[PDB]
Amino acid sequence: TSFTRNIVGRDGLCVDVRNGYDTDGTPLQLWPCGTQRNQRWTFDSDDTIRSMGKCMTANGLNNGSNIVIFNCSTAAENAIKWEVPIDGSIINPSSGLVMTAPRAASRTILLLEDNIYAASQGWTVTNNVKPIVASIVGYKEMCLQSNGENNGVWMEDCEATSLQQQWALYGDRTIRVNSTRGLCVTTNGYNSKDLIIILKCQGLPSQRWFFNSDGAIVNPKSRLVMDVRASNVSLREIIIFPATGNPNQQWVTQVLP
Numbered sequence: 001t002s003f004t005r006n007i008v009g010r011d012g013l014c015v016d017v018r019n020g021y022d023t024d025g026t027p028l029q030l031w032p033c034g035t036q037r038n039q040r041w042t043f044d045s046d047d048t049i050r051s052m053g054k055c056m057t058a059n060g061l062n063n064g065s066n067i068v069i070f071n072c073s074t075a076a077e078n079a080i081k082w083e084v085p086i087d088g089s090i091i092n093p094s095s096g097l098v099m100t101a102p103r104a105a106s107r108t109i110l111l112l113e114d115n116i117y118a119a120s121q122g123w124t125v126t127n128n129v130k131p132i133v134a135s136i137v138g139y140k141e142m143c144l145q146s147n148g149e150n151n152g153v154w155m156e157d158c159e160a161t162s163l164q165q166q167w168a169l170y171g172d173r174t175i176r177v178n179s180t181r182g183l184c185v186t187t188n189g190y191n192s193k194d195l196i197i198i199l200k201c202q203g204l205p206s207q208r209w210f211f212n213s214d215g216a217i218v219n220p221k222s223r224l225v226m227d228v229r230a231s232n233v234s235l236r237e238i239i240i241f242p243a244t245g246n247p248n249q250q251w252v253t254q255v256l257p
């Protein structure tokens, strides 16, 4: 009834108990991923998440409160229970606040903040601490392709040799240009028909995505899903749109060699 994994988030860095100290109150931070014990988190059926025999703990339950390691028995019960929603958040049920990395840098200290569905609030519980590299196959068995910073994404015939068809699926729930990992698939607004482009990763809600069980790629803040505009690949426009279940909104990841 328990299992142990890393937790990968912002910029592909991992949740790390700072300096590897286990004394009560030691902050959680981002640090490059590894196998050290202070990055190994055990998920127990009691909804605790433990490292080095101690619990991930909200040191307070307010906007901006720090998350620390603390003795599981002596901490407040409200402070040591967590849930891992399917969209990749890590939520403290008592407060409703979510784990947030407010900066991308190593040594950034993790905070509970109001959920805004930001990419800074996306996490992946996994033993593979590298981004998964895949083509994103969609409408007409075509492949999603990048076309540079600030430009639209669009569909093209799948080519094993097209680097701009290769996507790094990061633990913070961002979809990144594999060959330029500072750049993120980004919706240019949260309204229906807003265009999906490539922009510098800035941890924004516009840069967060969820691969749901229906084959959709969902932007959690807007609720909207990636859509090949008008089922017309020649428009070279991918938008966000309400989920319809139609072929122009169905996507599969295909892992690359």
Ligand SMILES: *[C@@H]1O[C@H](CO)[C@@H](O[C@@H]2O[C@H](CO)[C@@H](O)[C@H](O)[C@H]2NC(C)=O)[C@H](O[C@@H]2O[C@@H](C)[C@@H](O)[C@@H](O)[C@@H]2O)[C@H]1NC(C)=O
Residues within 6 Å of the ligand: 063, 064, 113, 114
């Ligand atoms: C919870 O904490 C967040 C980080 O402190 C707040 O965002 C920050 O709000 C500051 C003004 O209080 C502003 O100068 C900062 O730029 C901003 N930081 C970022 C990165 O957004 C947040 O406050 C809400 O959202 C901001 C953008 C403003 O609209 C505030 O008026 C809001 O209160 C805090 N959230 C809440 C609901 O308290």
Ligand SMILES: *[C@@H]1O[C@H](CO)[C@@H](O[C@@H]2O[C@H](CO)[C@@H](O)[C@H](O)[C@H]2NC(C)=O)[C@H](O[C@@H]2O[C@@H](C)[C@@H](O)[C@@H](O)[C@@H]2O)[C@H]1NC(C)=O
Residues within 6 Å of the ligand: 053, 054, 071, 072, 073, 074
């Ligand atoms: C969490 O805090 C508990 C209360 O301070 C620790 O249990 C206490 O450990 C003392 C020193 O080891 C021991 O004298 C006390 O009998 C015991 N108190 C109680 C109420 O059990 C606990 O330490 C862990 O569990 C105890 C029982 C021993 O097995 C320790 O060796 C364990 O470290 C603290 N937990 C951790 C992980 O530090």
Ligand SMILES: *[C@@H]1O[C@H](CO)[C@@H](O[C@@H]2O[C@H](CO)[C@@H](O)[C@H](O)[C@H]2NC(C)=O)[C@H](O)[C@H]1NC(C)=O
Residues within 6 Å of the ligand: 130, 133, 166, 178, 179, 256, 257
């Ligand atoms: C995706 O991009 C990554 C990062 O640039 C590429 O990975 C590098 O590949 C070279 C050659 O194999 C290795 O020597 C490095 O160790 C890799 N870097 C990292 C950080 O993993 C990768 O080849 C790209 N393409 C695919 C399909 O993954």
Ligand SMILES: CC(=O)N[C@@H]1[C@@H](O)[C@@H](O)[C@@H](CO)O[C@@H]1O
Residues within 6 Å of the ligand: 016, 017, 018, 019, 020, 021, 031, 036, 037, 038, 039
């Ligand atoms: C093994 C070990 O304790 N490693 C930690 C690492 O996980 C990180 O916490 C870093 C900076 O705070 O301090 C050490 O290098």
Ligand SMILES: CC(=O)N[C@@H]1[C@@H](O)[C@@H](O)[C@@H](CO)O[C@@H]1O
Residues within 6 Å of the ligand: 193, 227, 228, 229, 230, 231, 232, 239, 241, 244, 246, 248
């Ligand atoms: C079935 C079909 O092509 N639906 C598309 C829809 O998915 C979206 O792209 C919209 C934008 O105006 O255009 C059409 O309704």
Ligand SMILES: *[C@@H]1O[C@H](CO)[C@@H](O)[C@H](O)[C@H]1NC(C)=O
Residues within 6 Å of the ligand: 232, 233, 234, 235
């Ligand atoms: C698809 O888009 C292209 C390019 O803009 C346009 O020329 C064409 O007529 C469109 N096809 C349909 C069926 O609307």
